[PDB]
Amino acid sequence: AASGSALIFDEEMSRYKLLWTDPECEIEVPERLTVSYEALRTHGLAQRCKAVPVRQATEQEILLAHSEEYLEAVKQTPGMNVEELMAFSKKYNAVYFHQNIYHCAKLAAGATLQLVDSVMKREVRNGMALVRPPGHASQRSAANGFCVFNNVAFAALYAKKNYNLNRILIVDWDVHHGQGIQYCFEEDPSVLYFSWHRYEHQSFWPNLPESDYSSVGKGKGSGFNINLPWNKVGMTNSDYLAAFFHVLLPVAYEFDPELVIVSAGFDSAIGDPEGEMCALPEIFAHLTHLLMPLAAGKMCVVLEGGYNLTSLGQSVCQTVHSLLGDPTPRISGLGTACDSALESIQNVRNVQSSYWSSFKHLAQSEDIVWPEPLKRMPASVRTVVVPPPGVELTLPKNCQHSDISESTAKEVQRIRDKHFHDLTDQNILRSLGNIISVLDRMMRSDEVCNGCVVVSDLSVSVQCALQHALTEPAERVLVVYVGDGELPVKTNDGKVFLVQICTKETEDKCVNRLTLCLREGESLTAGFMQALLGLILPVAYEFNPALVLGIVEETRLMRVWGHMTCLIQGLARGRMLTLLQGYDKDLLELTVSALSGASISPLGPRAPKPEDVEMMEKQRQRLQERWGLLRCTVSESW
């Protein structure tokens, strides 16, 4: 029942800085916080968040992750002059100290714990902490890489201790490895750590052998540490999404965390002098959105690095936009990950295959400039619902019921007289008026985002929805069909891609459709999730539709439909129209809940049928030449 997003920030954390010459550290500046908060303010995002004050982490809280000797050493730095601060700093790798940095480090850590408490007490759904100094390179007894104390390691240890959590996912999308987090939880199966990072075969900072893909954790932590090293610079949106679809998300949804903490370094964005990657700030809107169906949306985003002030501001805004539920921007030009990334991805999937059900089939044979991001205003009415006539339902506050116009009514009659001569059922005709009215508000107004219409006649309804969308004009339409039979849907001209979930086995011929025949049984949920993350989402993202048309025929859906409806809203700026054939109160409630941006209830835990995995890998083989985002291995060369 939680709502809102926390934003935790205090300008005191900009009141320490580098006091001597050091080209290595001169990029970590106070303005990183100032620019990020002001960017949120400029775009109206800070004003929509719940401002939670910072506090100091206590001594006892710092000792959750750090040694008494290191804390006592850092505690003396407020009393040091500049000569003494420089000599203290030289004891460590890539870090400077300042009279006020100990104070600020305790605020950065306390801010993080405030964020954890706000989310874990259900006072907000999610939130972000904008802090300095960053934390993820901090070690038990050493400052490292601009980090004094390990803010995110605190947050996980604090959440285990005070909320008795058994499963916490940490996602570190900073462009540097967070070695301090890895070390902290190396033997701990209760904390799953994922990091991608510029590595370049160990020649990039921090130059550690243990930052490679072979470090899977130790002891009973084996399999709960996932390193994805980037061995070339210039990684793009496609490389980052390939990493999510084929490594992080399959593991995350199987792990089923009770809390997600993001080590959010935006030095992984285009323009950054440390990362030298090419991902656009818009990608962070999707990295955030793809994780929101985990842990019922309980996500704590904690600022780490990010050194190009421009992409820093833009990427922070894209993240908070998604935390607030604003429509995600369309990502164009996606395709195959590059060969270096595909090598990295296939190596981590292979070493992790001992530990995760999604990868188990692999174990045996049988001046930089870029365009400014567009505005992301939320829709006035997010979701319009059309239940059968005379069905009054209690709707969430951002949902509304359907009122057919005069122009719309004339359109239905023109359509009737041209394509459905022998049709007079005055409520089929009502549904067609409803479909056209909802689509018009979705496509020709920032007024409505998405919608759900309950229908009876599937063929007429589908044909009217699709044909009307194609002349809006919606350049491309993704159709997602749960049911058997043939739809009045042509996939011959490249403007429609059809995903069909059915029960009868079918040979696919064209590469503009994906047909998934999943065995009924206790394994159906895991197979569907496997298909959704590894097949459906890669193709949908590469296809980049302008509208998503969901269709469920009246003829096992309840557990996965909410996750699909949430994740598929990463496409088409969230513009999804769902046609439900027949009235099912629970399915309609679940659909409306997911469409409106409500928290998605967790899946919990049963590994997929090997016959389903074989079916899905045959689909990947059949489709990945056309849709390269499906690839999770390096291609065979002639």
Ligand X SMILES: CC(O)(O)NCCCCNCCCN
Smallest Cα–Cα separation from 84: which of 98, 70, 71, 94? 98
| Near Zn ion by CB under 5 A: residue from 61, 212, 267, 542 | 267
Nearer to K ion, 195 or 319 (CB): 195
Binding string to ligand X for residues 83 to 122, with x set by CB under 6 A, is what?
-----------x----------------------------
Q: From the CB of 275, what's the least distance to Zn ion, in Å? A: 7
| Position with the least CB separation from Zn ion | 305
| Near Zn ion by CB under 5 A: residue from 135, 206, 305, 597 | 305
* Token reading at 152: 């995110």
Nearer to K ion, 221 or 534 (CB): 221
Nearer to ligand X, 137 or 428 (CB): 137
Interaction between residue 146 and ligand X (CB under 6 A):
yes
Q: From the CB of 248, what's the least distance to K ion, in Å? A: 11
Q: From the CB of 338, what's the least distance to K ion, in Å? A: 19
| Position with the least CB separation from ligand X | 305
Are 225 and 334 in contact by the 8 Å Cβ rule? The answer is no
Nearer to ligand X, 304 or 440 (CB): 304
| Near Zn ion by CB under 5 A: residue from 127, 133, 265, 574 | 265
Are 22 and 96 in contact by the 8 Å Cβ rule? The answer is yes
Nearer to Zn ion, 27 or 412 (CB): 27
Q: From the CB of 132, what's the least distance to K ion, in Å? A: 18
Smallest Cα–Cα separation from 138: which of 103, 172, 179, 104? 179
Query: Nearest 5°: phi and psi at 230?
Result: -95, 120
Q: From the CB of 218, what's the least distance to K ion, in Å? A: 9
Interaction between residue 440 and ligand X (CB under 6 A):
no
Are 178 and 137 in contact by the 8 Å Cβ rule? The answer is yes
**Size of residue set near K ion by CB under 5 A:** 9
Nearer to ligand X, 257 or 305 (CB): 305
Nearer to K ion, 10 or 274 (CB): 274
Rounded Cα distance between 206 and 146, Å, is 12
Rounded Cα distance between 539 and 334, Å, is 10
Position of tokens 């100032």?
34
Interaction between residue 24 and ligand X (CB under 6 A):
yes
Pairing of strands 496-502, 513-517: parallel
Nearer to Zn ion, 144 or 593 (CB): 144
Nearer to ligand X, 178 or 297 (CB): 178
Picked from ligand X, K ion, Zn ion, none, the partner binding residue 205 (CB below 5 to 8 A depending on kind) is ligand X
Q: From the CB of 299, what's the least distance to ligand X, in Å? A: 20
| Near ligand X by CB under 6 A: residue from 45, 102, 113, 134 | 134
Picked from K ion, Zn ion, ligand X, none, the partner binding residue 296 (CB below 5 to 8 A depending on kind) is none
Query: Nearest 5°: phi and psi at 539?
Result: -65, -45
Strand order in the sheet with 399-401: 399-401, 381-386, 448-455, 576-581, 547-552, 477-482, 496-502, 513-517
| 3-state SS track over 201-234 | CCCCCCCCHHHCCCCCCCHHHCCCEEEEEECCCC
Nearer to K ion, 251 or 567 (CB): 251
Nearer to K ion, 185 or 205 (CB): 185
Q: From the CB of 191, what's the least distance to K ion, in Å? A: 5
Q: From the CB of 223, what's the least distance to K ion, in Å? A: 8
Q: From the CB of 136, what's the least distance to ligand X, in Å? A: 6
Nearer to ligand X, 176 or 631 (CB): 176
* Token reading at 147: 């980090």
Residue type, 76: Q
| Near ligand X by CB under 6 A: residue from 97, 193, 205, 266 | 205
Contact set for Zn ion, span 158-177 (CB under 5 A): 174, 176
| 3-state SS track over 402-414 | CCCCHHHHHHHHH
Are 602 and 630 in contact by the 8 Å Cβ rule? The answer is no
Q: DSSP labels for 350-376?
A: HHGGGT-GGGGGGGS------PPPPP-
Q: What Å distances lie between residue 435 and 411, 439, 450, 548, 585, CA to CA?
A: 11, 6, 11, 14, 19
List of residues 6+ apart from 290 with CB closer than 8 A: 244, 249, 567, 570
Residue type, 454: V
Q: Could you count the other beta carbons within 10 Å of the beta carbon of residue 4?
A: 16
- The dihedral through the CA atoms of 351, 357, 359, 360 has a sign that is positive
Are 257 and 155 in contact by the 8 Å Cβ rule? The answer is no
List of residues 6+ apart from 112 with CB closer than 8 A: 8, 129, 131, 135, 151, 152, 154, 155, 300, 302
Contact set for ligand X, span 211-270 (CB under 6 A): 265, 267
Binding string to ligand X for residues 269 to 308, with x set by CB under 6 A, is what?
-----------------------------------xx---
Contact set for K ion, span 210-269 (CB under 5 A): 221, 224
**Size of residue set near Zn ion by CB under 5 A:** 5
| Near ligand X by CB under 6 A: residue from 40, 101, 137, 317 | 137
Q: From the CB of 137, what's the least distance to ligand X, in Å? A: 5
Strand order in the sheet with 225-230: 50-52, 5-8, 126-129, 299-303, 259-264, 168-172, 191-198, 225-230
Contact set for Zn ion, span 456-495 (CB under 5 A): none
Q: From the CB of 197, what's the least distance to Zn ion, in Å? A: 8
What does the angle CA 465 – CA 468 – CA 469 come to, to the nearest 5 degrees? 85
Picked from K ion, Zn ion, ligand X, none, the partner binding residue 146 (CB below 5 to 8 A depending on kind) is ligand X
CA terminus-to-terminus distance, the chain: 56
Q: From the CB of 272, what's the least distance to Zn ion, in Å? A: 8
Quick check: helix, strand or coil at residue 249? helix
Are 320 and 5 in contact by the 8 Å Cβ rule? The answer is yes
Binding string to K ion for residues 180 to 209, with x set by CB under 5 A, is what?
-----x--x--x---x-x------------
Binding string to ligand X for residues 334 to 373, with x set by CB under 6 A, is what?
----------------------------------------
Q: Could you count the other beta carbons within 10 Å of the beta carbon of residue 364?
A: 7
Picked from K ion, ligand X, Zn ion, none, the partner binding residue 94 (CB below 5 to 8 A depending on kind) is ligand X
Smallest Cα–Cα separation from 265: which of 201, 196, 213? 196
Binding string to ligand X for residues 170 to 199, with x set by CB under 6 A, is what?
----x-x-----------------------
Contacts to ligand X by CB under 6 A: 24, 94, 134, 137, 145-146, 174, 176, 205, 265, 267, 304-305
**Contacting positions for Zn ion (CB under 5 A):** 174, 176, 265, 267, 305
State the residues that interact with K ion by CB under 5 A: 172, 174, 185, 188, 191, 195, 197, 221, 224
